[PDB]
């Protein structure tokens, strides 16, 4: 205790570029959070109820490289900044948060687990302000309840003068509506 995290790198520069072009990833997948990369950007994805969710501003319309070839997005909502792919085999699927605690954590690509106070449906305040450079590349990362269940994914940072005091996220609620709609 409390909730902790660590990261493991699975691919280098060259392999990432090649896998990007082939759409074929034969690597073993593990963990609740995937670190994703495109040609130009890196960011996060969180697997919830068998779908790997991330931000449209990272992934765009792109396929995800997979064991059988490129995986087509099963959910794409541009205005909500949300996309999802069926989770590849091996990703650890998270449970949505029920209880409704307002005491949250944000897990960053650096595998830090940072206290957040939920201020509304889609917003939470960083209890200790962070430099924006620290949060960059963490979009798609999970916001968790104290139990470790997921409330949503990191979308955007509210920042001034290079410091972020709060975060906007996409609630698991928005995932179900997106699934219900399509």
């Amino acid at each position: 205790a409390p909730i902790t995290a660590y990261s493991q790198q699975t691919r280098g520069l060259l392999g990432c570029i090649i896998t990007s072009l082939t759409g074929r990833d034969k690597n073993q997948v593990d963990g609740e959070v995937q670190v994703l990369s495109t040609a130009t950007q890196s960011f996060l994805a969180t697997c919830v109820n068998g779908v790997c969710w991330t931000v449209y501003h990272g992934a765009g319309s792109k396929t995800l490289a997979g064991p059988k070839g490129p995986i087509t997005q099963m959910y794409t909502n541009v205005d909500q900044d949300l996309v999802g792919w069926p989770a590849p085999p091996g990703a650890r699927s998270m449970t949505p948060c029920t209880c409704g605690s307002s005491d949250l954590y944000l897990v960053t690509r650096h595998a830090d687990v940072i206290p957040v106070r939920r201020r509304g449906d889609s917003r939470g305040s960083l209890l200790s302000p962070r430099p924006v450079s620290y949060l960059k590349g963490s979009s798609g990362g999970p916001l968790l309840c104290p139990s470790g269940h997921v409330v949503g994914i990191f979308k955007a940072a509210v920042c001034t003068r290079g410091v972020a005091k709060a975060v906007d996220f996409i609630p698991v609620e928005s995932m179900e509506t997106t699934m219900r709609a399509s």
């Binding site: 990261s7 493991q8 699975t10 072009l21 995937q34 994703l36 490289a65 590849p88 690509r109």
Partner: peptide, 13 residues
Amino acid sequence: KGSVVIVGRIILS
């Protein structure tokens, strides 16, 4: 115009 690629993962405890 390529695919998104998994380059790493984070394991939660």
